[PDB]
């Protein structure tokens, strides 16, 4: 449960991401594939090579959805219904994986938003990614 402070923290941090969200999207995936090689089992049809357009494009896709989620921080369940659906009934990614992408995304933001990645912002973002994870895995069963 995101507090008012959290929502603020998140909106601020993401605010700064701006035009780079797509790139950060791509970079987190790349960090994910290398750090947790088991996550590659869900992308057998992609070229997982560095700077692959498939990864880049997918990075964008993920970033936009996070953007949309920040925008509807108050109504996530509703803003991500379609995506919860897709993952629960089509993709069927194992829930453990969500924590791996989340971590890689924090690492990415840390590396790129030094001044903004304060302990309190770090805490907020974590809870945020956890929340998003929960929503995306709520219709699994």
């Amino acid at each position: 449960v995101l507090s008012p402070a959290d929502k603020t923290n998140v909106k601020a941090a993401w605010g700064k991401v701006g035009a780079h969200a797509g790139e950060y999207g791509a970079e987190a995936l790349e960090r994910m594939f290398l750090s947790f090689p088991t996550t590659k089992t869900y992308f057998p049809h992609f070229d997982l090579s560095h700077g692959s357009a498939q990864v880049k494009g997918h990075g964008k896709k993920v970033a936009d959805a996070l953007t949309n989620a920040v925008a509807h921080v108050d109504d996530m369940p509703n803003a991500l219904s379609a995506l919860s659906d897709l993952h629960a009934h089509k993709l069927r990614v194992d829930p453990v994986n969500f924590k791996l992408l989340s971590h890689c995304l924090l690492v990415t933001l840390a590396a790129h938003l030094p001044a903004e990645f304060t302990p309190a912002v770090h805490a907020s973002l974590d809870k945020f990614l956890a929340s998003v994870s929960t929503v995306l895995t709520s219709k699994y069963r």
């Binding site: 970079e27 960090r31 690492v107 302990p119 309190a120 770090h122």
Partner: protein, 145 residues
């Protein structure tokens, strides 16, 4: 651990640029803030009521330095983290009653602090190697439970 000579160099060289003092205090403080339940072991430290209060607490800072110190010394025994942390493993279990999951949480926090610190320098491939190390350390510390 199962570090490639190349992965070994990458760890080795970034570490050499690490101010243990600051990184240790920040890693431990971030832990107490992001995962508030870890504070159950530091009651005697004082005021952990706020990020500000945690980050400023000198007891936290000094404990952070002690922890990273020991971590630091373990990178010199990457081929036997197990024998390097055996006594520390027993202490944490038998005296401190610290759930090894805490070891994993810090590991991850540690990685965020390094990224925070080295920006550019902390590349995907450098993170992969660090991830292997934090996992390795956590595993070794949990070994005697």
């Amino acid at each position: 651990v199962h570090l490639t000579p190349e992965e070994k160099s990458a760890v080795t060289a970034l570490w050499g640029k690490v101010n243990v003092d600051e990184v240790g205090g920040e890693a431990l403080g971030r832990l107490l803030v992001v995962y508030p339940w870890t504070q159950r072991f530091f009651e005697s430290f004082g005021d952990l009521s706020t990020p500000d209060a945690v980050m400023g607490n000198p007891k936290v800072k000094a404990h952070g330095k002690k922890v990273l110190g020991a971590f630091s010394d373990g990178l010199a025994h990457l081929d036997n983290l197990k024998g390097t942390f055996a006594t520390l493993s027993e202490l944490h279990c038998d005296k401190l009653h610290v759930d090894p999951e805490n070891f994993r949480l810090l590991g991850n926090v540690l990685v965020c602090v390094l990224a925070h610190h080295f920006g550019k320098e902390f590349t995907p491939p450098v993170q992969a190697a660090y991830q292997k190390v934090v996992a390795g350390v956590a595993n070794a510390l949990a070994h005697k439970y």
